[PDB]
Amino acid sequence: MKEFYLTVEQIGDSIFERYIDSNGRERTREVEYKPSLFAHCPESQATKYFDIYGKPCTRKLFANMRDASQWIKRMEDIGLEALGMDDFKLAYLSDTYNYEIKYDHTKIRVANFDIEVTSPDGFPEPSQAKHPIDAITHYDSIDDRFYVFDLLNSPYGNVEEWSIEIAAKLQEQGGDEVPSEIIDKIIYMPFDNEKELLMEYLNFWQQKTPVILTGWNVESFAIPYVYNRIKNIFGESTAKRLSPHRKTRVKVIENMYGSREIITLFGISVLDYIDLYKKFSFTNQPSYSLDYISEFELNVGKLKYDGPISKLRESNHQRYISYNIIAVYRVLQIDAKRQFINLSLDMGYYAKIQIQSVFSPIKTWDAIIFNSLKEQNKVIPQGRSHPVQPYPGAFVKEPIPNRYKYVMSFDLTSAYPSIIRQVNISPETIAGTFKVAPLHDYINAVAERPSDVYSCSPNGMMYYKDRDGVVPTEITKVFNQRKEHKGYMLAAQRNGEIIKEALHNPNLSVDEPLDVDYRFDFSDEIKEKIKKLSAKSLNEMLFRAQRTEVAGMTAQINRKALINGLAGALGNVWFRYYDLRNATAITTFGQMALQWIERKVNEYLNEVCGTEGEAFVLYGDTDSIYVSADKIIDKVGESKFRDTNHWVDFLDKFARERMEPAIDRGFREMCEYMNNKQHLMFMDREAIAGPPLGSKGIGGFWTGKKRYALNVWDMEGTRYAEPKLKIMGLETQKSSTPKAVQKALKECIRRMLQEGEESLQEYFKEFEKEFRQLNYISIASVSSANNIAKYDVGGFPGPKCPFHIRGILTYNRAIKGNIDAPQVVEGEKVYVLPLREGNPFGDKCIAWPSGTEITDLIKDDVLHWMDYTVLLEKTFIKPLEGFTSAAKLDYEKKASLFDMF
DNA sequence: CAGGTAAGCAGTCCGCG
DNA sequence: GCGGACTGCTTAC
Ligand SMILES: Nc1nc2c(ncn2[C@H]2C[C@H](O)[C@@H](COP(=O)(O)OP(=O)(O)OP(=O)(O)O)O2)c(=O)[nH]1
Ligand SMILES: [Ca+2]
Ligand SMILES: [Ca+2]
Ligand SMILES: [Ca+2]
Ligand SMILES: [Ca+2]
Ligand SMILES: [Ca+2]
Numbered sequence: 001m002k003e004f005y006l007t008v009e010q011i012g013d014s015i016f017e018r019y020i021d022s023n024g025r026e027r028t029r030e031v032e033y034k035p036s037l038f039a040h041c042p043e044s045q046a047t048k049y050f051d052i053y054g055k056p057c058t059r060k061l062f063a064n065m066r067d068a069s070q071w072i073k074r075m076e077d078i079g080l081e082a083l084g085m086d087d088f089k090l091a092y093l094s095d096t097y098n099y100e101i102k103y104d105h106t107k108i109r110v111a112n113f114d115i116e117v118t119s120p121d122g123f124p125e126p127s128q129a130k131h132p133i134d135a136i137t138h139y140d141s142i143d144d145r146f147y148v149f150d151l152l153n154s155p156y157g158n159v160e161e162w163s164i165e166i167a168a169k170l171q172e173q174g175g176d177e178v179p180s181e182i183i184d185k186i187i188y189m190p191f192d193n194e195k196e197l198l199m200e201y202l203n204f205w206q207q208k209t210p211v212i213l214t215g216w217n218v219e220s221f222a223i224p225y226v227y228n229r230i231k232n233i234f235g236e237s238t239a240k241r242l243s244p245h246r247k248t249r250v251k252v253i254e255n256m257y258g259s260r261e262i263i264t265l266f267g268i269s270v271l272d273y274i275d276l277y278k279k280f281s282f283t284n285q286p287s288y289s290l291d292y293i294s295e296f297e298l299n300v301g302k303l304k305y306d307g308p309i310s311k312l313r314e315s316n317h318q319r320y321i322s323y324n325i326i327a328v329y330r331v332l333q334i335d336a337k338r339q340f341i342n343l344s345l346d347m348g349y350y351a352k353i354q355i356q357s358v359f360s361p362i363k364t365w366d367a368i369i370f371n372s373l374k375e376q377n378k379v380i381p382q383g384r385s386h387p388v389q390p391y392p393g394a395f396v397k398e399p400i401p402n403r404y405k406y407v408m409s410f411d412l413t414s415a416y417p418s419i420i421r422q423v424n425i426s427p428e429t430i431a432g433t434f435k436v437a438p439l440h441d442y443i444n445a446v447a448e449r450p451s452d453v454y455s456c457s458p459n460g461m462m463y464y465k466d467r468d469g470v471v472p473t474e475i476t477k478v479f480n481q482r483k484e485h486k487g488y489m490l491a492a493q494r495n496g497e498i499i500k501e502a503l504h505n506p507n508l509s510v511d512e513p514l515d516v517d518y519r520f521d522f523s524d525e526i527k528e529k530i531k532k533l534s535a536k537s538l539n540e541m542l543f544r545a546q547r548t549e550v551a552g553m554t555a556q557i558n559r560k561a562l563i564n565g566l567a568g569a570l571g572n573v574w575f576r577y578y579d580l581r582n583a584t585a586i587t588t589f590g591q592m593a594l595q596w597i598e599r600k601v602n603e604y605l606n607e608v609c610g611t612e613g614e615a616f617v618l619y620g621d622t623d624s625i626y627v628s629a630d631k632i633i634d635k636v637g638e639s640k641f642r643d644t645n646h647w648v649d650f651l652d653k654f655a656r657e658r659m660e661p662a663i664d665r666g667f668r669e670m671c672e673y674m675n676n677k678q679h680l681m682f683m684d685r686e687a688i689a690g691p692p693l694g695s696k697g698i699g700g701f702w703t704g705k706k707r708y709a710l711n712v713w714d715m716e717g718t719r720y721a722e723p724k725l726k727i728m729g730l731e732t733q734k735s736s737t738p739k740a741v742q743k744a745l746k747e748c749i750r751r752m753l754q755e756g757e758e759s760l761q762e763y764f765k766e767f768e769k770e771f772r773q774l775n776y777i778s779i780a781s782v783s784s785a786n787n788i789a790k791y792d793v794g795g796f797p798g799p800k801c802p803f804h805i806r807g808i809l810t811y812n813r814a815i816k817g818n819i820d821a822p823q824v825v826e827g828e829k830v831y832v833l834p835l836r837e838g839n840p841f842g843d844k845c846i847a848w849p850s851g852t853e854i855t856d857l858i859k860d861d862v863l864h865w866m867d868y869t870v871l872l873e874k875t876f877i878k879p880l881e882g883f884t885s886a887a888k889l890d891y892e893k894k895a896s897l898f899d900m901f
Numbered sequence: 902c903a904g905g906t907a908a909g910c911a912g913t914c915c916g917c918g
Numbered sequence: 919g920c921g922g923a924c925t926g927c928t929t930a931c
Binding site: 805 | 929
């Protein structure tokens with residue numbers, strides 16, 4: 001097989017590389033890598049190296065990496081550019097793997113671990129590591145085994161061995177319900193004392209050294225705790241055995257308010273699953289406890305136990321250990337679904353970076369572009385200092401707040417990356433500038449043509465047309481990948497709808513799910529067999545289709561995020577290719593494109609309708625338009641349609657056969673106007689929206705910019721079995737909105753859009769009547785809690801104290817003195833409830849850690865003093881009032897003359 | 902910690918005769 | 919109590 005790296009490090013003048021050799025074996029080597037850097041040289045100097053601008057360079061080969069780094073410093077002292085890849089391990093990887101890396105995941109050791117630490121005096125701080133580690137479960141991907149290290153004797157209690165037999169039993173049998181599919185994969189090791197446990201763990205770690213290391217909060221908790229505990233018991237040299245090169249570094253992670261400590265283990269790639277999830281999931285969660293996320297992702301119930309975790313080991317060691325094992329498995333289950341590790345490996349190897357660098361689009365693109373340029377013997381410029389400067393972004397149209405019955409939307413495929421490719425925007429393709437006219441002059445096509453030679457953006461920039469820039473070239477490659485995976489995602493989605501349809505008429509038989517590839521549209525034969533299947537088989541097929549869709553989603557949306565990150569990186573001062581001229585060329589072209597096409601669509605539709613000056617485009621954001629289709633439907637007449645699907649078909653046909661060709665002609669003219677390199681503005685129909693045929697539903701409404709709701713029947717070619725709400729920006733979409741309130745507001749909107757005013761009034765009246773029975777967690781608001789200290793003045797709110805911080809301070813006084821009570825963690829999320837006047841907490845609200853029950857100490861008092869009236873008005877009535885006034889609708893029945901009978 | 906700008910709403914402080 | 923200046927938080931792109 002072709003070799004591939006696992007990890008790479010620079011340690012002094014050596015590269016330390018772990019890799020898979022040509023036989024599939026893991027190896028480690030130390031290489032005295034001699035780096036090269038570059039300086040500009042005279043035109044007469046014969047060379048094959050040129051900077052990105054075509055200026056000749058001489059290569060300087062250094063005796064060692066320190067020599068190279070010192071040379072960079074001296075070049076700064078002289079005042080001359082030091083060119084080339086200054087991150088020497090990226091240069092090493094580029095030299096050693098001068099080919100597209102094909103990796104074999106089965107050979108990469110992926111470790112998933114979790115530790116338990118009993119502590120009677122509050123949260124066990126990793127930097128202190130003052131309490132024994134009493135459990136470790138460490139899953140190894142190569143062995144496919146859960147290795148369980150269990151401390152039986154501790155200063156906090158001596159316990160009996162964990163029983164695998166009890167662990168397997170149902171909760172109703174007194175067991176722990178450790179999933180049957182992992183029972184045979186557990187390797188259980190009990191220990192008489194902690195020193196022995198840790199020594200054996202380290203020997204095990206040396207035998208089975210993780211390449212990728214993951215788990216839940218491992219970077220912020222498990223890794224520093226294990227490192228510091230071992231350091232405290234045995235000394236530093238022993239703790240450094242966690243690194244295969246015996247090198248570690250305390251790394252300070254700092255933001256705008258305070259800092260924290262993590263341990264860098266050289267020769268290991270740590271991908272904490274919480275961070276993978278936050279980056280790659282495109283969710284924003286009220287809580288990031290593993291319990292909360294597992295419930296959300298997997299629909300598994302929380303692991304229940306009696307009493308605090310600080311007493312769980314002594315009271316019920318059996319469950320304590322079973323829960324440690326299940327916690328490790330839950331991360332594996334989430335990954336089986338989301339495939340973030342696979343994503344990271346894909347992106348890391350593609351870029352030729354340390355895998356953990358996938359968190360940084362700047363580093364990722366720096367490496368992609370360097371490797372691309374190196375292929376041509378071109379030489380990357382030195383990174384420079386730039387002051388942070390604001391720059392303009394997208395255009396967003398101000399909508400007229402209203403109901404909108406029939407709506408068709410369109411938006412550009414990969415807008416910003418497509419603009420980059422179309423205009424040819426790149427550091428080395430800048431050709432000059434032209435004298436700019438006001439933006440509206442380009443939008444209305446009255447401005448002088450910018451250039452008859454170069455490709456232009458209405459910010460004044462001109463670009464070469466003779467050859468593609470490296471940014472367009474490399475962005476196109478990742479775009480093509482994204483497009484492939486999105487194809488699979490949408491096929492899986494359409495396949496899901498077929499199954500949902502079939503589930504209306506399930507067959508009374510015993511059978512199996514069909515063995516099919518859900519990434520491809522079902523054939524006629526498959527469709528026929530599906531129509532003959534049982535509910536059991538259909539539901540299994542739906543589950544599989546939906547898992548396939550999720551896998552496609554992960555692969556596509558994060559490749560989209562990467563390419564969009566390149567457009568953004570051009571406006572990030574830490575990017576090697578930072579240039580506000582290029583960043584603004586993208587954003588300003590986008591503003592033009594949107595407003596240009598708004599004009600063209602209006603002109604086209606006024607033509608086909610025989611009107612003048614009428615606004616068909618009601619809204620737009622960045623690269624999208626929302627077109628009122630009422631007059632189109634009305635031109636045929638509603639009574640001509642057999643059912644909802646009939647007019648959806650008609651609008652779909654109108655969009656594809658009339659709208660899109662007109663849109664395309666408008667954009668081709670714009671491309672010619674700007675003299676662009678290639679027409680790539682592809683604005684395809686997104687949504688077809690409207691009320692169900694014959695209903696009193698309103699179809700959709702807008703309250704303002706970035707705040708709307710649509711009843712969608714077809715989304716990017718997926719024809720839904722049941723209408724789906726596309727809701728953007730409204731409170732139903734915000735993690736800060738109480739769970740039960742999101743649900744109720746969503747139902748109000750569904751009723752507005754699908755059923756009408758009377759239906760809405762019926763639901764509101766019921767909700768208002770019953771909501772006091774809702775569980776306190778379901779009606780609590782959520783907020784991130786930053787700067788708790790700033791606003792804390794002797795335990796009381798300081799000037800300008802935010803509402804949620806006030807709540808936290810109220811909580812702190814209420815639990816004061818308790819070493820055991822859960823503390824609110826700076827920067828994490830809290831639940832927030834308002835409190836009735838004259839409550840014993842002495843303030844108008846209380847807040848506590850999100851994803852948790854409030855401590856039993858005060859729970860009864862919170863429940864008793866909760867202000868339901870305020871809660872209802874702020875989270876429910878006020879947003880609903882916003883929706884209904886916008887839609888010109890009443891959520892309460894107004895008086896009428898009929899009342900007099 | 903890690904990636905760009907636009908823009909919405911909650912809430913504080915305080916004016917507004 | 920609404921509106922502005924401001925902070926804080928959170929979404930749409
Ligand atoms: N830097 C950055 N830019 C974004 C992000 N989301 C959207 N944008 C910018 C770049 C996009 O091209 C543009 C339009 O947003 P869209 O959500 O419609 O994405 P895009 O057109 O790229 O892909 P699409 O084919 O519509 O799925 O807005 C983001 O998360 N980061
Ligand atoms: Ca635990
Ligand atoms: Ca788009
Ligand atoms: Ca599309
Ligand atoms: Ca059937
Ligand atoms: Ca869009």
